[PDB]
């Protein structure tokens, strides 16, 4: 598989478009392994990859190098090997939208909690805020749309859902995701040896407090 659309993102970055998160993740590793000259950062997201460059001079040469890259695997994983999960996050399922998620998914609140805790999630990529991890490969039944309008304030440790993702809000902030509960786990701490609790590639298990 070859690249799709490659936009110039200003004069010193390139925005790569993809049809799925699975393709975003596969291409991220390919780009990361390619160790391209002038690349400052590789920013995977839901349907794109932003390749940030050291200067405008790198733009056209990087576009050319990108054309020679081929998606290294094409065969990917959606289950934790050895059944060992990297981290377990304990959640109190008292979220504001728990009953709404139940209605939208065609499940009861009990089934929502059981689905969220029953299938481990993989941290696909980080974005939004320091320590905010977009989780993938969890229970597909949980797929729920974003809120019509974002909330002004969502509490720190808010466990949420949107589209194919789950995630934990590291600090109090505005948010448009569907809130199902909260955790007392510290997602981000600048003084901790590993500042962000969740790193891309890690497998997470959610566990209900009770």
């Amino acid at each position: 598989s070859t690249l799709g659309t490659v936009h110039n993102y200003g004069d010193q970055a390139l925005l790569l478009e993809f049809d799925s998160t699975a393709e975003v993740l596969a291409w991220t590793e390919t780009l990361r392994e390619a160790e391209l000259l002038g690349v400052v950062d590789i920013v995977p997201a839901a349907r794109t990859v932003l390749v940030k460059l050291a200067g405008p001079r790198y733009q056209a040469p990087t576009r050319q190098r990108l054309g020679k890259l081929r998606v290294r695997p094409e065969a990917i994983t959606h289950q934790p090997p050895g059944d060992r999960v990297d981290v377990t996050i304990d959640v109190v399922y008292d979220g504001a939208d728990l009953h709404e998620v139940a209605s939208l998914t065609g499940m009861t609140p009990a089934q929502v909690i059981a689905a969220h805790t029953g299938t481990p999630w993989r941290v696909g990529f980080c974005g939004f805020a320091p320590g905010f991890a977009y989780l993938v490969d969890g229970d597909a039944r949980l797929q729920v749309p974003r809120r019509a309008e974002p909330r002004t304030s969502v509490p720190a440790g808010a466990v949420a859902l949107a589209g194919e993702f789950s995630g934990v809000y590291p600090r109090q902030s505005p948010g448009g995701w569907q809130l199902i509960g909260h955790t007392d786990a510290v997602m981000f701490d600048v003084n901790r040896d590993k500042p962000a609790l969740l790193t891309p590639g890690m497998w997470v298990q959610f566990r209900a407090v009770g």
């Binding site: 925005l15 839901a46 405008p56 980080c126 974005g127 805020a129 320590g131």
Partner: protein
């Protein structure tokens, strides 16, 4: 060792450097000096490496007393008529300050941010490999307060001082900015309105984003949601209200608003010198298709 004791700050005095790049994998933005050219200039004048931290001063008004020895300093960016014990010394020039003397920046009429460099750099503790303060996540050395004691890093004593290329004056009212069209210009009914409008800068502007007001940009599909995507400083986001925001150094790593265009590298540092109430005019770097 040698220190700088903060006597007065002005509206906002921050420790800044070239930032913390490559941290998207942990949701951390690069941050750093809002005007990278002036910051690097201030370091070069004092013969510091480019990585040394300076003090980014907003609207001038910053004062510091030198203690424990002599220092070599330089002030770049907005011209604040800097002084030592009330006597002016000139922006964009290396200046030698003695133990006990007071470095004082005045108030600029043109530009917004000034950079105070000291030979050896502002040696505060780095946070995630950078001495930059990120106004959004509050990562980095805290905004400066009167009473703060800033250490001066170790340095050699290399003389003479290297002469630097002259500096172009900062735009006083109308700032003209070059914009690379896209990637989401197709989201707007008339993206060309962006480049035919006198945008006004509001007082709500900060290092997260410059807020512009004028005739709102209408969406072709107003209820359409963009999946979150990586952003850069200089990217022009268009929230649902149609008022463009030009992202600054403290923008989050990803954003959910369609980007109509991105300011060119040549003009990105000019963004750090735009004062509230000024007029911003945008122009396509190359034709839109």
């Amino acid at each position: 060792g040698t220190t700088l004791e903060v006597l007065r700050t002005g509206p906002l005095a921050l420790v800044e450097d070239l930032g913390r790049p490559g941290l998207a994998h942990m949701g951390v933005t690069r941050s750093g000096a809002a005007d990278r050219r002036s910051h690097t200039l201030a370091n070069r004048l004092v013969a510091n490496p480019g990585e040394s931290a300076t003090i980014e001063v907003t609207f001038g008004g910053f004062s510091a007393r030198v203690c424990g020895g002599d220092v070599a300093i330089a002030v770049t960016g907005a011209d604040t008529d800097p002084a030592v014990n009330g006597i002016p010394f000139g922006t964009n020039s290396i200046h030698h300050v003695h133990d006990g003397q007071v470095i004082s920046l005045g108030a600029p009429h043109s530009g917004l941010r000034s950079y105070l460099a000291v030979r050896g750099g502002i040696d505060v503790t780095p946070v995630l490999g950078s001495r930059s303060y990120d106004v959004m996540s509050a990562i980095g050395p805290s905004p400066l307060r009167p009473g703060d004691v800033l250490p001066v890093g170790e340095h050699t004593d290399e003389f003479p001082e290297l002469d630097q290329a002259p500096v172009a004056a900062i735009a006083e009212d109308v700032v003209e900015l070059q914009v690379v069209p896209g990637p989401r210009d197709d989201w707007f009914v008339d993206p060309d309105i962006l480049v035919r409008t006198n945008w006004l800068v509001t007082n709500r502007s900060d290092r997260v984003g410059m807020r512009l007001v004028g005739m709102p940009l209408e969406y072709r599909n107003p209820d359409r949601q963009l999946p979150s995507e990586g952003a850069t400083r200089g990217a022009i986001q268009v929230p649902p209200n149609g008022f463009p925001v030009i992202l600054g150094p403290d923008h989050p790593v990803t954003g959910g608003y369609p980007v109509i265009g991105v300011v060119t590298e040549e003009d990105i540092d000019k963004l750090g010198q735009v004062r509230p109430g000024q007029t911003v005019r945008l122009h396509w770097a190359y034709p839109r298709r």
